[PDB]
Amino acid sequence: LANADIPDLFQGEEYDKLLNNLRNKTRSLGLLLDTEQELYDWFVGEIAKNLHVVFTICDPTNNKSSAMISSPALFNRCIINWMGDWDTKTM
Amino acid sequence: QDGEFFDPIISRLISREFNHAGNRVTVEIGDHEVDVSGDFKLFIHSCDPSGDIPIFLRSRVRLVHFVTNKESIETRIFDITLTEENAEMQRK
Amino acid sequence: GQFHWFYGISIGQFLSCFKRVFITRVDEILWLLYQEVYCQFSTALDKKFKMIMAMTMFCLYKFDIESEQYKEAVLTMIGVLSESSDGVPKLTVDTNNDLRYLWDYVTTKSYISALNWFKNEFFVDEWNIADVVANSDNNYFTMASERDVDGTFKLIELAKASKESLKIIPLGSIENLNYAQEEISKSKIEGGWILLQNIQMSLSWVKTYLHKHVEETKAAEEHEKFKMFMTCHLTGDKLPAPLLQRTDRFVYEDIPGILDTVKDLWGSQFFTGKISGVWSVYCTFLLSWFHALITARTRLVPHGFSKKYYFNDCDFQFASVYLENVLATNSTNNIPWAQVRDHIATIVYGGKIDEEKDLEVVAKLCAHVFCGSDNLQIVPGVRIPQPLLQQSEEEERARLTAILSNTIEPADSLSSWLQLPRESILNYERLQAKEVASSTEQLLQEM
Amino acid sequence: HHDQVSKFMKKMFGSIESIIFLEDFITGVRSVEGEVLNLNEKIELKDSIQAQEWLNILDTEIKLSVFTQFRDCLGQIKDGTDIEVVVSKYIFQAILLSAQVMWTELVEKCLQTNQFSKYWKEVDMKIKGLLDKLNKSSDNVKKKIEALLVEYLHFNNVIGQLKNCSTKEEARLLWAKVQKFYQKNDTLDDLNSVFISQSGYLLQYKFEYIGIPERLIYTPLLLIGFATLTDSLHQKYGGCFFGPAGTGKTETVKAFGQNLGRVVVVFNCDDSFDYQVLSRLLVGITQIGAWGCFDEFNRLDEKVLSAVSANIQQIQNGLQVGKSHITLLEEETPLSPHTAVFITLNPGYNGRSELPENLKKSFREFSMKSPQSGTIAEMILQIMGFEDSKSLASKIVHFLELLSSKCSSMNHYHFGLRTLKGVLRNCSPLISEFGEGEKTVVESLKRVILPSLGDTDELVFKDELSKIFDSAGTPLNSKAIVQCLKDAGQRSGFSMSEEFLKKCMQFYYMQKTQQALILVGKAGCGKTATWKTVIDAMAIFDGHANVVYVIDTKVLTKESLYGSMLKATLEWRDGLFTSILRRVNDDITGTFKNSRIWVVFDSDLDPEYVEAMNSVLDDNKILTLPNGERLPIPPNFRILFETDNLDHTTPATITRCGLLWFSTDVCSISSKIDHLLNKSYEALDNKLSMFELDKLKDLISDSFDMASLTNIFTCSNDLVHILGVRTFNKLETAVQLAVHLISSYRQWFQNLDDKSLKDVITLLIKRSLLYALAGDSTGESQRAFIQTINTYFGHDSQELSDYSTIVIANDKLSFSSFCSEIPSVSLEAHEVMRPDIVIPTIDTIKHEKIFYDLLNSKRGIILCGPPGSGKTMIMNNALRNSSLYDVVGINFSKDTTTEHILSALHRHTNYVTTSKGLTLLPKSDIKNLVLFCDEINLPKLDKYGSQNVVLFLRQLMEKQGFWKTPENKWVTIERIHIVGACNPPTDPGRIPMSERFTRHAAILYL
Secondary structure, three states, rough: OOOOOOOOOOOOOHHOOOHHHHHHOOOOOOOOOHHHHHHHHHHHHHHHHHHOOOOOOOOOOOOHHHHHHHHHHHHHHHHOOOOOOOOOOOO | OOOOOOOOOOOHOOOOOEEEEEOOOOOOOOOOEOOOOOOOOOOEEEEEEEOOOHHHHHHOOOOOOOOOOOHHHHHHHHHHHHHHHHHHHOOO | OOOOOOOOOHHHHHHHHHOOOOOOOHHHHHHHHHHHHHHOOOOEEEEEEEEHHHHHHHHHHHHHHHHHHHHHHHHHHHHHHHOOOOOOOOOOOOOHHHHHHHHHHHHHHHHHHHHHHHHHHHOOOOOOHHHHHOOOOEEEEEEOOOOOOOOOHHHHHHHOOOOOOOOOOOOHHHHHHHHHHHHHHHHHOOOOOOEOHHHHHHHHHHHHHHHHHHHHHOOOOOOOOEEEEEEEEEOOOOOHHHHHHHEEEEEEOOOOOOHHHHHHHHHOOOOOOOOHHHHEEEEEEHHHHHHHHHHHHHHOOOOOOOOOOOOOOOHHHHHHHHHHHHHHHHOOOOHHHHHHHHHHHHHHHHOOOOHHHHHHHHHHHHHHHHHOOOOOOOOOOOHHHHHOOOHHHHHHHHHHHHHHHOOOOOOHHHHHHHOOOOOHHHHHHHHHHHHHHHHHHHHHHHH | OOHHHHHHHHHHOOEEEEEEOOOOOEEEEEEEOOOOEEEEEEEEEOOOOOOHHHHHHHHHHHHHHHHHHHHHHHHHHHOOOOOOHOOOOOHHHHHHHHHHHHHHHHHHHHHOOOHHHHHHHHHHHHHHHHHEEEEEEEOOHHHHHHHHHHHHHHHHHHHHHHHHHHHHHHHHHHHHHHHHEEEOOOOOHHHHOOOEEOEEEEOOOOOOOOOOOOOOOOOOOHHHHHHHHHHHHHOOOEEEEEEEOOHHHHHHHHHHHOOOOOOOOEOOOOOOOHHHHHHHHHHHHHHHEEEEEEEEOOOHHHHHHHHHHHHHHHHHHOOOOOOOEEEEOEEEEEEEOOOEEEEEEEOOOOOOOOHHHHOOOEEEEOOOOOOHHHHHHHHHHHHHHHHHHHHHHHHHHHHHHHHHHHOOOOOOOOOOOHHHHHHHHHHHHHHEEEEEEEHHHHHHHHHHHHHHHOOOHHHHHHHHHHHHOOOOOOOOOOOEEEEEEHHHHHOOOOOOOOHHHHHHHHHHHHHOOOOOEEEEOOOOOHHHHHHHHHHHHHHHOOOOEEEEEEEEOOOOHHHHHEEEEEOOOOOOOOOOOOOHHHHEEEEOOOOOOOOOEEEEOOOOOOHHHHHHHHHHHHHOOOEOOOOOOEOOOOOOOEEEEEEEOOOOOOHHHHHEEEEEEEEOOOOOOOHHHHHHHHHHHHHHHOOOHHHHHHHHHHHHHHHHHHHHHHHHHHHOOOOEEEOOOOHHHHHHHHHHHHHOOOOOOOHHHHOOHHHHHHHHHHHHHHHHHHHHHHHOEOOOEEEEEEHHHHHHHHOOOOOOOOOOEEOEEEEEOEEOOOOOOOOOOOOOOOHHOOOOOOOOOOHHHHHHHHHHHHHHHOOOOEEEEEOOOOOHHHHHHHHHHOOEEEEEEEOOOOOOOOHHHHHHHHEEOOEEOOOEEEEEOOOOOOOEEEEEEEOOOOOOOOOOOHHHHHHHHHHHHHEEEEEOOOOEEEEOOOEEEEEEEEEEOOOOOOOOOHHHOOOEEEEEEO
C-alpha cells in the first residue's frame, strides 16, 4: 500500500525476468519506453490501479488487529469504514 | 481433540459452505476440493478454558461448557442437605 | 492450591467433608460446616496456611453473623497486625467481649498469640496425624514437610501404638526402587504398613511405575488392611497433580526444641560402639549442642541467618569425622582447639554458606561452643566441664547424659540460648504475623 | 603401522600428544605442552603384537618413569643442588613434586627450631635465581620455569606467613591448612610412596603424567577449595562447587588433580554433547579409577540430566559402600575406589543452581567466591621484578578499592581485579621505560584507569592517587609526540585544545599496550578526529605508514563481515573483516611489514558481533572461523571501536580492550567553525579562482565574530526543537550554508558598494544561522528567534524579517532587497488530483527556496513534520522543476533492508570502474541524483536497538562510500544526495533516530 509493489518479490534474477516480461507486454499494448525507470513506473502504476485490498477486521480491540489500524501505510491508503454493531432497526 | 489450536482450513467446514453438484457436494479445503458425505459429523473438543479460540470459530461454533465449576458446588450441596434434612420430599 | 502445588482440593473432597457434617437449625449446620472444614483441610496445610485459613474462615462466618460494628472493629485489628493501617477499634461497654480480649493480645505486642486466637475460636479438635490417618479411608498418603525435619520417626511411633507393621523403604538407586516395587506388591497382600522415604528424588520413576501402579490398584481397597505412606519435601520437586489428588495429604509441622534435639543427637551416639578416647565423647557432646544450636538458628530468618540454610545429619557426620581425626592425629592435650573451629566453621558447615554476613555467625558459634577451658556454659543454665581425671568413658557418657536431664528449656530460649537478642525475635514474630494478616485480607477482597 | 596410534593417545591420556619410537622400541612420549618424557625401559615391539597389550605396558611404565625422574631429582636437591641445575634435566611434573617434598620437609623442621628467616632468604634467592634464568631461556623450558615459579612463590609466601605468627600454635594452625607433600621413607610399592596431607587428611599421589600445565596462582581461597575437595574425598563423597561463572571452579578441580598427579577428565556438559558418549566415558573412569569433573553440570536437558544424575549416584553409592562391582548402563562393570566425580554448578537466571535430589546425599556442595585480589596482586608484582611487592599490592588494591567507593557509580566502571591484572599487565612494558618501582605502577594506573574516567571522577582519581602514593614530577615522551600531534592537526584543520590534546595523548599511549581500542562519546565528540589525528602523527614520528579500514559494524551481517557458511553445500566465502586480514597474513605481497594496519568499527557494537571475534580480544591474537580455520593477527594490525554508547556490551569485552571515554567534546564552538570554514574553502578552490577565493574568505572573517554568536547559540537551547539535535552538531549546517550563500553572489561582489556588500553578507549569515538553529523549530519560535538573532548581532546591520530576501535582475546586474513574490496558478478540472500538483503559497516558496539552498551545500536534509504538511511535495516540486537534480523515491516500512535502498538506486545508477576511485557509483545520467527516503523513522531496530538502514545512510552521508555486501569491496558514491521526510517521533509508530546520523542533516520542521 505505501508503494504499489513489494520490492522483495521481484529482485535479482527474478527482477530481470520481470523486467523482460514487462518489455513484452508494454510493447504488445503499443508503447515502448526509452529508460529502465520509464518501465518500472508502468509496472507499479498498473498494480496501483488493478489491485484492490479490502481488510475485514472484527475486533479492532484485539492487539493484532490494532496493529492493522496502527500501521501507517494501511491507515493512510485505506478507507476506514465502521459496521461494528447491528442496530435495533436492522435487527 | 485440541480445539484451542485450530487452523484456518477447516474454516469452510465450520461455516456451512459448499459447492453443490448433480449428486456430489464439494468443500474447499486449503487447495483440494473434497466431497462431503452427509453421514459425516464434526465435534471440536478443548480441555483448557484458559486457551482462547479465534473469533471466526467462536461465532460459528456452539460453545458448550462441560465444566465442574465452583458454581456446581452450590447446586450439589443442596441435594446432599435435602437428603439429610427432608428425606421424604427428596425421595418424591 | 494456586500458591502451592501440594495444597490441592477436589470438589469431591469438600462434598465428602460436608456429608460428615450430619452423620437456627440452618445457623447450627452452618457452624457445623466451618468446623468440619477446619477439621479436615487444616491437616494438609503448613502452620502459616493453618493460621491464614483460621483468620479467613473466622471472618467468613462472623461478617454474615455478627454486627456491622463488629466487622470494622476486627478488620481494623487485622489491619494493625498487617502494615495496612493502625487504629483503635470502636469501644463499647460490654458490647463485645471476645473481640475486646483479642485487641488486648495485639496491643500487648504479642503476635503469635493473636494469630492463634482465631484457631481457638473455632472450638475444633485440631486433628493429630494419627486421628486423621485413622479416620481416613484410603490406603495411600503423602506427607510433605520442610527439609529441617522428617516425619519418618513420627510414623514409627504411629505404627507402634496401633497395628504395628512398619516397613521403611528408601528409594535410592536401581536396587532400592527395584526392591521397593517388590515390597510394595507383597505388603498389600500381607497388609503391612509401608513407607516410601523421599520419593521426590526418585520421581522420574513415579510417573512411570507408581503413577500407573497406584491408579490400577482399586483392588487395594479389596486387599488386606494396608496403608502406604510417602514422604515429600514442600520446597522441592513438584509431584504429579493427578497422583497427588488421589492420595491423602498431611504436613508434618512439628519442630523440636533446642534441648530436645541435643538429646536426640546424643541419643544415637551410643550405638556406634567404642573406638575412640573418653575425651572424644566430650567433643561429640560439644558437637551435639553445636548442631542443635545452628539448626535452631536456621528457621529464624531473616533475623538470625540471612537465608534459609539446611544442615544435615551429614553435616554432623562430616564434623564428627574431623573430630575423631584431630584427636587421632594429636595428643590428648586440650589445646588442639584452634583448627578444630576453623575447619568446622568454614569447610564442614561454612561450605554451603555463600554470604559473608552468615559466615561470621557460624564462626562466632564455634568461638563459644569449642574453645572453652574448665567451664563452657553452652547455655545460661547449663555448664559443661571438661573430662575428669578419673577418665571413665562409661561414667562420662552417663555424666553428659545427666547434664541434659538436669536442664529444662526456658521460655525465652530462642533469645537466651541462641545468643541473638530478644528484640530480634519479636521483630520476627511481627513479620510472620504480617504475612498471615496480609494473605487473609487479600483473600476476603478477592471473593 | 603403530605410529598412527599416537593421534588417538591425546584423547585417551589427556596430558600426552604423540608417542616416540625407535620403531622396534618406544623411547618415550611427548605431552600436549611440548615436554618430552623418556621411559626407563624402552618397550619392545613386534608386528604381531596387540595395541591393547603394548599400550597397557606404556601406561604402567609412564607412571614408573615419573617416579624414577622424581626420586632421582628429589635426591639431588637433598644433596644441596641449585634448582637452576635440576630444571634443565628433569621433566616438570617430577621437579615440582621434588620441590614440594623437600620444601615440606625443610619447613616441618623449621617449625620446631623457628629458623624461618634463614630458610626464607634461602627460598627468596632461589626465586630471584629462577627469574633471571627465565629471561635468557629457550621457549620450551620457559614454560617449565614459569610453572615452577608459581610454586616457589607459594613456598616463600607460606614461610613468610609462618615467620609472622604470634606463637607456635598459630604456626601449627596455618601449616595444617596447607597442602603438605609427604613421602614414606619406610616402604615398597613406590607408586604408592608419595602421599599428601591437608587439614589432617591424607591422599595418595597417583603417579600419572600431567605434563607442564598452566599452573594457577596459589590463593588462600584456592587452598580452601583444595581443603573442601580433600574433606569430601576422605569420606568417599563427590566434590561439588557451585558459584558464578569466571570463579575457576573447574580449573580448581583440574589443579587439585595435578597436585596429586592426576589428569582430570572434564565433561563440558550440554555443548551439544551426546549421552551415549558420556555413558561410555563414565564406565572408563570407574574402571581406570580417574577423576571426572562435570563442567557446568547445570546446563543439561531434563531427559539427559535425569539419566546422567542417576548413573552418577551409582558411582558415588558404589564408592561410599565400596562395592567391588556396580551396575550402570545395565551391565556389571567393576569399580576402582580411586574414582571420583566432581560437579561445578554455574548459576541460572533464577539463582545459584542445585544438585538433583539423589546427588544431595552423595556430594558436598561448596561456594566459590572471587579471590580477594590483594594476594594475586602481590605475586604478580613478585614475578615481574618486585621492588617492594607487598607494599604495592596493598597500595594498588586500596587505591582501586578506594576509587570504587569514591567515584560515581557509572556503568562501564570496573574496579574489580580484572582491572588490576590489566594495570599490572600494562605495567611490564612500562617497567622497561622506568623502574620496577611504584612510579611505574602509578603511571600504569593513569594509563588504564584514567582514559575511562569522566570529569567528576577524574579528580577523585588524582586526589586519591596522590593520597595513597606519590611517585614523580616529570613524564617521558612529553615533547616528542606532542609536536608530532600539533603538526598533524594544523594540517588536518583541527585546534589543539586542553581536551583534544588530552584525549590524543590518552589514545597514543594506549595503542602501544592495547591492540583493541574502544572510543566512547556523544555524536560529534571528536573521536574520528582524535584517532585520525594520532594515527597521522605516528607516521611523522615513527616513519611507519598506516592502512586504515573504516567499517560500519552493524550495516553488514555477522555473515557479511566475519564469514558466512551455507548449511548444505558448506561453501565457504570470505566476508569483510576476514578478507582484509588475508591481505596482511596470507599474501603480504606489497609492504605490510613496515605499515600499521587499523581496522575501525564506526557503528554501534553488540555482543553477537564481538563474541564472533572474542578470540582476537583474548591473549590468543588469532581469529577463529565458524568452519575451517584460525587466522593469527600481527602486532601491526589494531582494531578500533568508535561508538556513542556501551549499554549492550559485557564488562568482559571492555576489560580485554582499552577504553577511552570522551566526557565532553574535544573542541570549542569557535574552533569548530574555524576548521569548518577552512574545510569549506578547500572545496571551493577546485571550482573558484584564487582572487575570488581570497576576497570571499576575507568577507566571512569580518562579518561574523564569535562574541555575538555566543549568545545566539545559548538562546538556541531556550527553544523547543522538533527532532532534537545538539547545538554543536548543528554548526556544520550554518557554515556550509553561509559559505555557499556568499559564493552564490560572488560575481556581484566585484562591482558592488563596500558598505552595501557587508549588508548582503550579514543578511545571508543571519539567514543561514537561523535555519541551522531554529529550522527545526515551530516557526512561531522561528519568528521569535529571528528577533533574538537581530538583538545579538550589530544593531545597525541588516535586520532579519520572516520572509526577508535578496533579489537581482532578470536582464541586468542589479541590487535590491524585496520579499515574497508569487507566480499565479490556473489548472484545469482534470489536473485537480495529481501526485505532482502544487498551489504555491508565501510559505511554499519560503521552504522550497531554503530546501534547495541546503542541497547546493550538499548537506543532507530531514524534513520533519505532521502528515499532510507538504514535506514530500516541497521536496519533490523544487526538484521536479530543475535540470540539475533528479529524485528517486524510497518508502521505508517497519522492517525495510539496506538492499532495498541499493536495488532502488541500481535502477537510476551506473557503476564505473575508473582507476581514480576504483569502483564508483555515480548516477546513470550525467547530472545530480537525490534519494528521497520517506518515513525514515519507521524501520525498526535490532533487539539491542540499532536500525541498520539509518546507519547505512549515515555511511553514505559521512563516508561517501560503502562496502559491497557480497563482492566485498569499497565503492565510492559520486554526486548522490540523501534527503528524508519523517514524522515527529512523538507520533505513534515512530522510532527514535541516532544522533550520529541526524548530525549530518539539516532539519526543517514544516
